[PDB]
Amino acid sequence: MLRRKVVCLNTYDLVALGVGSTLGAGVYVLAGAVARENAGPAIVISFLIAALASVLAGLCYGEFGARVPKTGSAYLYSYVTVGELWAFITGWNLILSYIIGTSSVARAWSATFDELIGKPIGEFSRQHMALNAPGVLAQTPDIFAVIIIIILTGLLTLGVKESAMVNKIFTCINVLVLCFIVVSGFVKGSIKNWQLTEKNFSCNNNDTNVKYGEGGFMPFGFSGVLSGAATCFYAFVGFDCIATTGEEVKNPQKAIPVGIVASLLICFIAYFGVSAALTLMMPYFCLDIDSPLPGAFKHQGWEEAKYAVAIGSLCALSTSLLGSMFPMPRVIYAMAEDGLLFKFLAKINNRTKTPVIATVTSGAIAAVMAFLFELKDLVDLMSIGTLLAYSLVAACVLVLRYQPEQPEKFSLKSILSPKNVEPSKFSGLIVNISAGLLAALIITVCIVAVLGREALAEGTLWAVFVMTGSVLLCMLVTGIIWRQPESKTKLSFKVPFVPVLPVLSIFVNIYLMMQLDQGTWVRFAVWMLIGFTIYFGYGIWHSEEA
Amino acid sequence: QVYNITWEVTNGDRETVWAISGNHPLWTWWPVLTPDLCMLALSGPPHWGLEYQAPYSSPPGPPCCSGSSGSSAGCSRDCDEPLTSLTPRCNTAWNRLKLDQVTHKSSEGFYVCPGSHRPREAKSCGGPDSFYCASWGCETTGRVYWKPSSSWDYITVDNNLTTSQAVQVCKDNKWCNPLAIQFTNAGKQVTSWTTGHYWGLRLYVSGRDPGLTFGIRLRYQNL
Ligand SMILES: *[C@@H]1O[C@H](CO[C@@H]2O[C@@H](C)[C@@H](O)[C@@H](O)[C@@H]2O)[C@@H](O[C@@H]2O[C@H](CO)[C@@H](O[C@@H]3O[C@H](CO)[C@@H](O)[C@H](O[C@H]4O[C@H](CO)[C@@H](O)[C@H](O)[C@@H]4O)[C@@H]3O)[C@H](O)[C@H]2NC(C)=O)[C@H](O)[C@H]1NC(C)=O
Numbered sequence: 001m002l003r004r005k006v007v008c009l010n011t012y013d014l015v016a017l018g019v020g021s022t023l024g025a026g027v028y029v030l031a032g033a034v035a036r037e038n039a040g041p042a043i044v045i046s047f048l049i050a051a052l053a054s055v056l057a058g059l060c061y062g063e064f065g066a067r068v069p070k071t072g073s074a075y076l077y078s079y080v081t082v083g084e085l086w087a088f089i090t091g092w093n094l095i096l097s098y099i100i101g102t103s104s105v106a107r108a109w110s111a112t113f114d115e116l117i118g119k120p121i122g123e124f125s126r127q128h129m130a131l132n133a134p135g136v137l138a139q140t141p142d143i144f145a146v147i148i149i150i151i152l153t154g155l156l157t158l159g160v161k162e163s164a165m166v167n168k169i170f171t172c173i174n175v176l177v178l179c180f181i182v183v184s185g186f187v188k189g190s191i192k193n194w195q196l197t198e199k200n201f202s203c204n205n206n207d208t209n210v211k212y213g214e215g216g217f218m219p220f221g222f223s224g225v226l227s228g229a230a231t232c233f234y235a236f237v238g239f240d241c242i243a244t245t246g247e248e249v250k251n252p253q254k255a256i257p258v259g260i261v262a263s264l265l266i267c268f269i270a271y272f273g274v275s276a277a278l279t280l281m282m283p284y285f286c287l288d289i290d291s292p293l294p295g296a297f298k299h300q301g302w303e304e305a306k307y308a309v310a311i312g313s314l315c316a317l318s319t320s321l322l323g324s325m326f327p328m329p330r331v332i333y334a335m336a337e338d339g340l341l342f343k344f345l346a347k348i349n350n351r352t353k354t355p356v357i358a359t360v361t362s363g364a365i366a367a368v369m370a371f372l373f374e375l376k377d378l379v380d381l382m383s384i385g386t387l388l389a390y391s392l393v394a395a396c397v398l399v400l401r402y403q404p405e406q407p408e409k410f411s412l413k414s415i416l417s418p419k420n421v422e423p424s425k426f427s428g429l430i431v432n433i434s435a436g437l438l439a440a441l442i443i444t445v446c447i448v449a450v451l452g453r454e455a456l457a458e459g460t461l462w463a464v465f466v467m468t469g470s471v472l473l474c475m476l477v478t479g480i481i482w483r484q485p486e487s488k489t490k491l492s493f494k495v496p497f498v499p500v501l502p503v504l505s506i507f508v509n510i511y512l513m514m515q516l517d518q519g520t521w522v523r524f525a526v527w528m529l530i531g532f533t534i535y536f537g538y539g540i541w542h543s544e545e546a
Numbered sequence: 547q548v549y550n551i552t553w554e555v556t557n558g559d560r561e562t563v564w565a566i567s568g569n570h571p572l573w574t575w576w577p578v579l580t581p582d583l584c585m586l587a588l589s590g591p592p593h594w595g596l597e598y599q600a601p602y603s604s605p606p607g608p609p610c611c612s613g614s615s616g617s618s619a620g621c622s623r624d625c626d627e628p629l630t631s632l633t634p635r636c637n638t639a640w641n642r643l644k645l646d647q648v649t650h651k652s653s654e655g656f657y658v659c660p661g662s663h664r665p666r667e668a669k670s671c672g673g674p675d676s677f678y679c680a681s682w683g684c685e686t687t688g689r690v691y692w693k694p695s696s697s698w699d700y701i702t703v704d705n706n707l708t709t710s711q712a713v714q715v716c717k718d719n720k721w722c723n724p725l726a727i728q729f730t731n732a733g734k735q736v737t738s739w740t741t742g743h744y745w746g747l748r749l750y751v752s753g754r755d756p757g758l759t760f761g762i763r764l765r766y767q768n769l
Pocket residue numbers: 550551552565566567568602765767
């Protein structure tokens with residue numbers, strides 16, 4: 001269960017890859033949905049939080065990848081450093097991330113293309129095939145998304161690889177379109193749309209069941225802002241492609257963190273500008289459900305601009321889509337090659353020299369998830385999986401920073417006030433126990449801060465007592481971790497505040513996970529149950545380290 | 547002799563926002579005034595969202611899709627969505643739902659503080675800017691957990707309609723925050739109603755406890 005394993009692109013190239021993968025559905029489709037449903041103009045703030053969390057995780061990766069000479073996905077680093085069960089959990093979460101990202105981006109791109117051509121494909125889908133399960137499954141099955149995923153899986157199986165030149169060209173086109181969107185919003189949009197009142201709570205169309213909120217900058221409150229931030233964390237995903245690709249890098253461990261941070265900041269700037277433009281050109285409750293940005297452009301009289309956006313989106317959604325489809329089999333293959341998953345997934349075809357079985361299985365799963373579930377459901381599922389993976393990696397960094405270099409009874413004095421200058425096995429055990437306790441207490445705090453939010457506002461004694469005790473004990477345990485000595489082993493890059501910053505990252509990630517709806521949590525629980533079943537039924541016994 | 551008596555409830559600016567009338571002898575008719583908490587807020591403090599609305603104006607805000615009139619272009623579903631994130635005010639139907647919830651919750655409610663007619667000691671509480679009470683213990687009526695009461699207070703204020711009754715009226719987009727104001731024995735003895743008297747009603751919430759100033763006065767004409 002704890003078995004550990006024995007282990008050019010420029011910085012601008014890494015930044016381009018990260019921007020290409022990260023930018024996409026999050027801004028071109030989900031921005032309007034979050035602006036209309038979860039947060040209003042305050043969506044601009046919703047990205048900011050989602051950005052900072054995305055930064056907090058990213059920094060950890062820089063250290064997490066700095067500890068392993070061989071560059072690769074977080075599964076590689078976990079299986080090198082922490083053990084086998086944690087590595088399997090991380091790899092399973094990454095597999096969910098990639099599969100559901102493929103599904104969601106395929107949905108968004110299929111919907112965009114269908115709307116561009118007058119929504120004929122969606123009309124046919126409604127006419128000939130209805131799931132009839134509005135609560136759980138999608139009202140409209142996206143057959144075109146299935147076709148797209150089938151085509152791209154066929155391309156991948158036959159040996160098609162990442163064309164960096166095409167990625168750069170599409171990223172440049174998308175960034176130009178985003179800059180045009182920002183400029184058009186600041187030219188046509190007005191601050192009055194951020195100051196709406198009941199006098200303006202009337203979309204001149206014939207729509208009904210419109211949520212007008214309170215109006216103003218934050219119509220749905222800071223709770224809505226936090227929900228929007230949890231949703232928008234989806235937009236910042238995909239920066240992991242830099243490490244995942246595995247192609248030789250001029251300065252891997254130094255360019256990778258810099259590239260990740262630069263891509264995250266650039267994506268945050270783009271998202272902030274585009275969301276501000278969208279909410280300034282058109283009222284948040286007036287935003288078109290199918291096409292928010294083209295709808296806003298039409299509202300301002302720049303109808304033809306829908307074509308320009310229709311280009312940029314169809315570019316970004318392409319680069320984003322492949323960004324999820326290319327890594328998707330690789331991790332499985334790795335998990336198949338390490339014996340954690342079924343060995344038939346590790347089989348490589350002689351003709352193609354690629355993991356054909358793994359690619360086909362992952363593509364079929366992604367196509368099914370796209371066929372059955374709505375865009376928002378897939379987005380939230382991927383968000384919860386990615387947040388869990390990020391929290392796991394942050395905890396990995398926090399624990400490993402204090403562990404002694406690898407090949408119960410305790411005393412209060414040694415725990416509170418150790419005097420050894422370098423970590424011992426006792427210090428490592430204390431830090432592991434402290435990390436577990438801190439994770440449990442952070443989960444408790446987030447549960448009380450969300451489920452008992454009204455109770456905390458109501459001031460009920462039990463809720464306030466639990467909150468205060470949990471926060472104080474979290475601070476105490478973080479201090480205990482502070483007192484322990486850090487490993488003197490030199491690292492190319494380090495988290496600046498490794499005893500606080502990873503804890504804050506874990507807290508933020510878990511809090512954002514709590515913001516997600518019950519359906520997302522149920523789906524994630526079922527996925528984790530399947531993963532644990534596979535691990536404990538097949539992973540342990542067939543592990544190559546056995 | 548018998549006069550056409552009329553009891554008027556005025557906003558903070560002393561403009562008549564509600565009124566009842568009847569033919570009675572002077573000082574013999576003491577009806578249960580039932581002004582809407584929102585009517586008192588017409589042209590009131592900016593918090594209630596009616597600072598520019600004139601007295602007797604129609605209730606603002608789009609109709610709820612769940613209202614008796616059914617769905618319509620621009621109808622709002624906020625009246626069915628959770629009210630936890632809404633501010634208690636009177637600018638929209640769902641805001642009026644939130645105001646009713648705040649005014650009916652046991653842990654919350656409203657407290658009314660006497661104004662000019664209050665004694666010298668109560669004068670220490672504060673001026674109209676504080677809604678006649680800047681310190682606790684200056685409320686003589688209103689619905690709150692400690693249930694304030696004063697023998698010398700002229701009126702007693704409570705919620706006229708329950709939450710279940712008020713929800714449907716809110717969904718109809720009508721005024722749905724009626725306040726039952728009953729003259730006390732001390733108030734009945736008082737004959738200065740013609741000049742009029744003023745109170746300050748403040749919501750009991752987590753925050754500034756937003757409030758407004760209202761007044762009650764009597765007019766009479768030849769029958
Ligand atoms: C007994 O007295 C009451 C009230 O007297 C009124 O107030 C006094 C202070 C003094 O100014 C009096 O001169 C004055 O009449 C009488 O009830 C009022 O009756 C008048 C008409 O006689 C109403 O005047 C308005 O007329 C508008 C059309 O010109 C009409 O649109 C109004 O309806 C709208 O506005 C009222 C409030 O003004 C609102 O309640 C309605 O629902 C509607 O929106 C209105 O009819 C007054 O409104 C009446 N009420 C008041 C408080 O003034 C009553 O007639 C009288 N009875 C006898 C037998 O003498």
